Amino acid sequence: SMEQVAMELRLTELTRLLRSVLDQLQDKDPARIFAQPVSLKEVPDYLDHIKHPMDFATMRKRLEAQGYKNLHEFEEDFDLIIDNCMKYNARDTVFYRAAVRLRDQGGVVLRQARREVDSIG
Numbered sequence: 067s068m069e070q071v072a073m074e075l076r077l078t079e080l081t082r083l084l085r086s087v088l089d090q091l092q093d094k095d096p097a098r099i100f101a102q103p104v105s106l107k108e109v110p111d112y113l114d115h116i117k118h119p120m121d122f123a124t125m126r127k128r129l130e131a132q133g134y135k136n137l138h139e140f141e142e143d144f145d146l147i148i149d150n151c152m153k154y155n156a157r158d159t160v161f162y163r164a165a166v167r168l169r170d171q172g173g174v175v176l177r178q179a180r181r182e183v184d185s186i187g
Contacts, residue, residue, distance in 0.1 A: 067094075084137070087140070095164065097160075100120060100121055100168065101122050104119055120146035121147060137179060
């Protein structure tokens with residue numbers, strides 16, 4: 067149908083916008099602490115601690131399969147990155163601190179992304 071195509075164009079355009087959001091968020095992680103999944107070879111107990119691991123590469127795979135239907139789903143995944151880190155790692159670590167800085171800086175980007183998603187529809 068033509069309606070299915072129109073819906074698919076909206077999804078493609080959301081995907082375009084979330085790709086730009088993802089790039090901007092990942093620039094706020096210049097140490098690349100959150101770039102890749104936590105290694106289960108190097109942290110073998112990780113899944114005993116963290117039930118839903120997340121990282122920027124995993125988000126990018128979902129994004130490119132157009133697997134985020136709305137901004138809420140994308141934000142859920144970004145929040146997992148931060149929240150998992152702040153539980154696994156103690157307050158006095160470079161990892162925890164990187165997450166705090168990513169959260170604070172990403173808030174600005176996400177605030178305007180929400181306005182853009184509503185605005186453009």
